Amino acid sequence: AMLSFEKKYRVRGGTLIGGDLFDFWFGPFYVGFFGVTTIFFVTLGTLLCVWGAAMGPTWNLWQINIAPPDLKYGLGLAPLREGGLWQIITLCALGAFGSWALRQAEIARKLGMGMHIPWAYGGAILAYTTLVVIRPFLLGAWGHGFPYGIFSHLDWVSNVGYQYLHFHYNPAHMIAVTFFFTNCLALAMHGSLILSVTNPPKGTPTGTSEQENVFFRDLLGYSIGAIGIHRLGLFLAVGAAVWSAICIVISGPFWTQGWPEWWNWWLNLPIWK
């Protein structure tokens, strides 16, 4: 089925690989070559997660836990029953997430859009790749990855935090948190402003860019403008994930003490040592 304006847009072209062979739709979805590779990796990676649940202790959704290998296996593939399955699923996940971004690039090209959406999603892929490839590689064992399980990965986050005694003191983490919180504020403001001009009190004319510009200036003391608020949202949201990736990759590979004692440099500046 198609939107009442859609058919006009369903042309060939814009594919990065495979020419016309995969250039077609399946219901709402565009396929394309990276559509095919997406479904391959999604299906394989999902069915291996189901197998990980089957050979584990329970089917309870919250408790399923596909753990990485012991650190003693280093950068090798463990026995599948001992974390090797987690490694294969990780390769599936990387394949899926990469295919998804490249498929989005084909869709954007076919509509004459800029590439902004694939690159924004690249920020999430970077954070994932840091957690399961780059940081475990710099530490020398794939077992430093997080387990695939809805609550068991929160146990991993907890224990990694306390490996540095007081993870709140991580300086890059403070920046990343500030981006996440400021992003949520900015999203609430932008959402509210657009809705409040397009949905005024009953018996009131539809508002204008001038009214939202005036109200925004009353809120922040300056006028961001229509292009600017979307630039700011993208900057805050993607910047949050980039600073997240930084804050975890420095924890272990680069800094190994508690995070509070990192701040010793500030206390020892020569103006006040």
Partner: protein, 176 residues
């Protein structure tokens, strides 16, 4: 048959194929919202939102920016398509919305949405010409017209922007 396109084959979810020139007919990334209201957009006080700068002396180029007027416009085929005669401005959110281009080797003047222009060296230095990467200097002749030269309708905005949008797919193609 005036119908702008036909299915590539009979299976579900197959692409369409344009019959005529997709940039003129408006198919795929060259298409526009054909039911869009054919009226000017308005400021809060009800004046025309997008107008040529000569109609509102409130507006002027920020000091130490180049005025683009009189510069040549270089198309995707490196040909000189024309020269900038006028700027159109958004009066609700002050910015340049369109360049107006006097066509080289032609009678006609056409609008050019600034999203499709770029400066050499991205404006940092030089600034002696404008680059339009999306269409050839021949295709500049077919850019849609506005009914009047003092105002532009929302439909005319959609038509003009859709023309340059399609170029990145169709400008260097025999599909015309």
């Amino acid at each position: 048959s005036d119908v702008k396109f036909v299915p590539a084959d009979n299976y579900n979810g197959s692409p369409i194929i344009p019959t005529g020139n997709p940039m003129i007919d408006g198919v795929g990334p060259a298409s526009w919202a054909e039911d869009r209201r054919d009226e000017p957009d308005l400021t809060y006080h009800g004046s025309h939102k997008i107008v040529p700068m000569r109609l509102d002396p409130t507006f002027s180029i920020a000091k130490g920016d180049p005025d683009p007027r009189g510069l040549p416009v270089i198309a995707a085929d490196k040909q000189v398509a024309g020269t900038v005669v006028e700027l159109w401005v958004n009066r609700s959110e002050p910015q340049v919305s369109y360049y107006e281009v006097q066509l080289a080797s032609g009678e006609r003047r056409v609008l050019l949405p600034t999203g499709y222009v770029q400066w050499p060296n991205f404006g940092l230095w030089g600034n002696d010409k404008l680059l339009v990467k999306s269409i050839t200097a021949a295709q500049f002749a077919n850019v849609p017209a506005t009914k009047r030269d003092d105002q532009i309708t929302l439909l005319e905005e959609d038509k003009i922007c859709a023309y340059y949008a399609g170029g990145h797919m169709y400008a260097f193609a025999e599909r015309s």
